């Protein structure tokens with residue numbers, strides 16, 4: 001008969017999955033696969049929190065596929081190596097994927113499409129990771145992605161309204177389509193543990209961001225309910241991970257960005273009684289869309305050299321200073337607490353991202369945004385290659401049409417956000433004995449207060465790695481020199 005395979009990569013969900021929906025129709029068998037390769041050289045920068053989140057996403061998909069008398073098939077290796085084997089072993093004639101706009105993904109999928117055509121396999125590709133067809137955005141702009149956010153808002157406003165999200169895969173949708181299964185299915189296709197991937201899980205606590213579609217849909221309800229109770233304002237509690245947080249689920253595809261969009265539009269129309277909401281309503285959704293669009297045709301989006309849209313800034317190379325930043329031992333408790341939360345949990349507030357990005361690049365250390373991006377790629381759960389690269393370029397003053405002239409204070413920003421320093425004490429236990437007057441600048445604490453706090457600066461917690469007033473004055477001057485001769489730094 002017609003034997004079909006749906007290939008999960010992103011879109012780790014059964015709701016709003018047009019590719020899986022189309023693949024099942026007219027099919028006699030269906031197998032959903034995820035191709036996992038934790039040893040891939042190109043994935044050497046993936047942190048353990050990302051691996052854990054993904055594995056929890058796969059367990060949730062497997063559990064939800066159980067409800068449809070199916071299972072997830074987890075397969076080890078590289079798609080180019082695995083798919084020809086599967087095409088023959090399973091006699092596959094249909095393969096479905098959610099479209100991937102990112103350059104590496106487009107390249108991989110082009111190769112797989114060639115293997116499928118060679119094997120007599122029809123390839124079904126449907127767009128569902130983004131709100132729009134990004135290629136249509138670019139065509140509407142004249143063939144180039146809009147290089148500014150409000151130009152992007154202009155084009156998007158002129159587009160056709162979004163079509164309804166695809167129906168969720170139910171028993172009545174599967175119909176006669178079945179999944180051939182064996183009693184030993186877990187031995188060959190089961191979802192592995194972190195330990196089974198060779199990871200020592202020593203030092204791991206319960207995940208602050210549990211993966212999966214079930215979690216995402218539960219959080220979506222809470223998120224809308226809280227919104228039922230304009231751009232929000234950050235306070236101290238905003239720094240903590242929220243049970244209403246959706247951002248990692250949108251990144252992995254646990255939550256459909258189109259479903260989220262429609263639920264937001266639905267809620268707005270109920271409270272504000274009109275169908276033309278402020279683009280404010282969608283929060284980061286269009287920033288998300290903006291960076292996917294800017295990156296899709298730029299294979300060097302994550303680089304400075306050879307990247308046509310990036311300002312060629314002469315950053316310093318300082319591996320020791322970069323390591324202090326990445327490992328949260330800069331000696332600035334505000335910076336270190338943020339980098340510690342990021343490493344421990346996999347999410348930090350957007351304004352905390354601005355703070356540590358400024359400190360590393362244009363503000364204090366004058367280290368390339370490429371190096372910050374690599375660290376964030378390792379640890380951050382909610383930012384794809386396209387969004388990470390674009391965000392680091394924009395925030396480091398590396399885009400020609402976005403400048404920041406105010407340098408974040410690595411003491412005052414934290415003190416102004418959380419005056420008592422509860423955030424510091426939560427993530428930097430060595431500093432817990434310091435009173436609020438010194439918690440953001442413990443080097444200013446007299447020797448007696450340090451001894452009482454059982455924390456000698458330079459012994460138990462490092463001294464501040466730079467003099468911020470001097471470093472920022474020099475770096476503000478350097479950035480002013482660059483933008484005074486901006487065209488000279490065009491590649």
Ligand SMILES: COc1ccc(-n2nc3c(c2NC(=O)c2ccc(C(=O)c4ccccc4)cc2)CS(=O)(=O)C3)cc1
Nearest residue numbers: 247284287288353354357382383387388391392394395
């Ligand atoms: C520093 O490292 C990172 C920082 C942020 C992220 N990040 N993660 C996600 C998203 C983003 N990024 C942005 O939303 C974004 C928005 C505005 C700008 C900006 O230039 C600007 C202009 C005017 C005023 C204020 C700001 C830059 C970035 C959206 S998402 O895909 O949903 C999940 C990743 C790494």
